[PDB]
Amino acid sequence: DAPTVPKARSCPFLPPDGIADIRAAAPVTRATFTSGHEAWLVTGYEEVRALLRDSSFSVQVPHALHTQDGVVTQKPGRGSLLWQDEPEHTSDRKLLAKEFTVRRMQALRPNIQRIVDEHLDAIEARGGPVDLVKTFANAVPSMVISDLFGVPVERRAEFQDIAEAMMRVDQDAAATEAAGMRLGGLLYQLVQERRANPGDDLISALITTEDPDGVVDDMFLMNAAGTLLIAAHDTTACMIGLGTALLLDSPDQLALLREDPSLVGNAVEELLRYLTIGQFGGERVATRDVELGGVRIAKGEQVVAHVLAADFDPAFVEEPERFDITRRPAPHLAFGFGAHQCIGQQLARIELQIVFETLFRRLPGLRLAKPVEELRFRHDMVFYGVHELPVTWHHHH
Ligand SMILES: CCCCCC[C@H]1C(=O)O[C@H](C)C/C=C/C=C/C=C/C=C/C=C(\C)[C@@H](O)C[C@H](O)C[C@H](O)C[C@H](O)C[C@H](O)C[C@H](O)C[C@@H]1O
Numbered sequence: 389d390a391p392t393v394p395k396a397r398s399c400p401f402l403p404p405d406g407i408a409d410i411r412a413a414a415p416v417t418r419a420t421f422t423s424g425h426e427a428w429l430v431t432g433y434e435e436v437r438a439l440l441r442d443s444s445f446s447v448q449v450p451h452a453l454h455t456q457d458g459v460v461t462q463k464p465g466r467g468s469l470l471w472q473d474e475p476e477h478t479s480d481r482k483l484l485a486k487e488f489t490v491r492r493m494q495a496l497r498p499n500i501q502r503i504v505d506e507h508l509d510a511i512e513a514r515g516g517p518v519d520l521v522k523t524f525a526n527a528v529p530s531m532v533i534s535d536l537f538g539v540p541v542e543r544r545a546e547f548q549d550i551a552e553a554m555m556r557v558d559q560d561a562a563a564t565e566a567a568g569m570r571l572g573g574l575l576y577q578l579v580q581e582r583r584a585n586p587g588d589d590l591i592s593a594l595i596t597t598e599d600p601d602g603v604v605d606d607m608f609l610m611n612a613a614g615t616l617l618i619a620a621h622d623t624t625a626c627m628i629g630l631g632t633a634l635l636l637d638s639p640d641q642l643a644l645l646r647e648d649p650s651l652v653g654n655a656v657e658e659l660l661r662y663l664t665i666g667q668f669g670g671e672r673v674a675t676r677d678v679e680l681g682g683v684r685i686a687k688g689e690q691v692v693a694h695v696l697a698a699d700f701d702p703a704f705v706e707e708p709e710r711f712d713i714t715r716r717p718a719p720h721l722a723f724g725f726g727a728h729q730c731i732g733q734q735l736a737r738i739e740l741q742i743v744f745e746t747l748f749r750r751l752p753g754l755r756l757a758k759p760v761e762e763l764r765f766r767h768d769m770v771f772y773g774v775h776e777l778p779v780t781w782h783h784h785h
């Protein structure tokens with residue numbers, strides 16, 4: 389039996405302790421995963437990039453290595469992207485990217501600022517202490533993406549609850565699929581509504597997009613909306629609560645940011661790299677024999693791109709365990725790489741910049757109200773983070 393992949397973190401803001409020696413000795417190696425299956429663990433930065441850029445790997449993998457039962461949940465089809473291979477991944481991503489453009493992400497900045505300031509108004513009005521996860525981290529990115537999609541305000545809490553029920557590694561396939569099925573009911577209503585009553589929203593723009601092959605039908609819209617809505621809710625929330633917790637535990641770094649809000653672009657790149665919240669790694673399967681880091685991977689063999697390990701490779705950046713927001717941004721792997729690299733990463737960066745800049749400006753003396761060693765971290769979720777973050781700040785006399 390290949391050694392189990394290290395999971396335990398003695399420092400909750402760092403990778404599992406065992407990872408570094410594995411990456412150093414054998415950045416492509418056999419390991420046993422949570423499901424009990426053996427597969428290839430890829431931990432080295434250059435090798436994860438090579439893995440992710442190689443189009444002979446498929447995302448239609450045989451096992452769910454990160455769940456106990458190993459059962460692969462039934463994934464949505466065309467429009468969802470994450471679970472598609474070329475050539476349909478390529479054409480369908482192009483259709484989505486025609487309307488979900490980086491310039492349109494950029495044009496969300498004033499709305500995202502308003503949402504942030506509104507949730508901080510509510511925090512100041514209630515006074516401290518507060519749990520920043522429930523009052524701010526989960527709520528803000530939900531409002532941003534729900535506004536882009538014209539999701540009625542009374543349904544948004546249900547979307548948030550689906551991400552909490554669905555994006556887990558501590559349950560069986562039946563539980564995960566039931567939450568996926570409830571999400572389909574919400575997506576079906578939303579697509580029907582946009583078709584019936586088009587508006588200034590992203591589904592309505594996709595409905596009218598150039599579509600010579602007639603691929604944009606309701607199932608495609610539901611699948612695209614589901615992937616975008618859930619990814620945008622869960623990942624960004626996790627980064628907000630965890631990057632906040634890390635800065636609140638990093639006094640020299642938080643002082644630099646407080647001195648200079650214009651460093652927040654560098655700080656968000658370093659937070660993404662350092663926290664790499666996709667903690668268990670991306671799964672792929674070889675569709676032909678390939679050589680990866682000089683190791684033969686056989687057709688049909690599953691492989692895990694451990695982006696958290698890769699972002700701590702000392703060959704990628706100097707002293708990678710040092711959290712340093714003054715570093716020049718480098719091309720970390722927090723959004724993946726190659727064909728599947730995050731289509732939403734510019735919107736994610738914009739949200740994080742506005743969130744962290746405004747948060748640390750507007751709550752003077754923000755600081756933890758519960759020590760890190762007592763927080764509940766997300767070892768049980770696909771995306772890492774904290775389940776709660778109690779904070780306090782200077783009182784407004
Ligand atoms: C490189 C390191 C990162 C690895 C990340 C690994 C991480 C990931 O890729 O995250 C994305 C990057 C961001 C998350 C996106 C989430 C998308 C959810 C979309 C859901 C769509 C649902 C509909 C259309 C329903 O109508 C029909 C559908 O068929 C119902 C299914 O049941 C839904 C599945 O349950 C969803 C599945 O559970 C999510 C994966 O589990 C996410 C994965 O685990």
Ligand code: HEM
Pocket residue numbers: 468469470471481533615616617619620621623624627665666670671721722723724725727728729730731732733735736
């Ligand atoms: C900080 C927040 C985010 C992180 C860390 C993140 C991470 C990632 C990663 C690692 C992947 C690639 C998965 C793989 O290769 O298997 C990805 C893909 C994807 N993400 Fe993001 N994501 C974030 C925010 C967003 C947002 C805001 C959106 C939507 C607006 C979004 C939409 C998507 C979609 C649709 C894909 C699939 C792209 C494809 O398969 O071609 N994500 N994300």
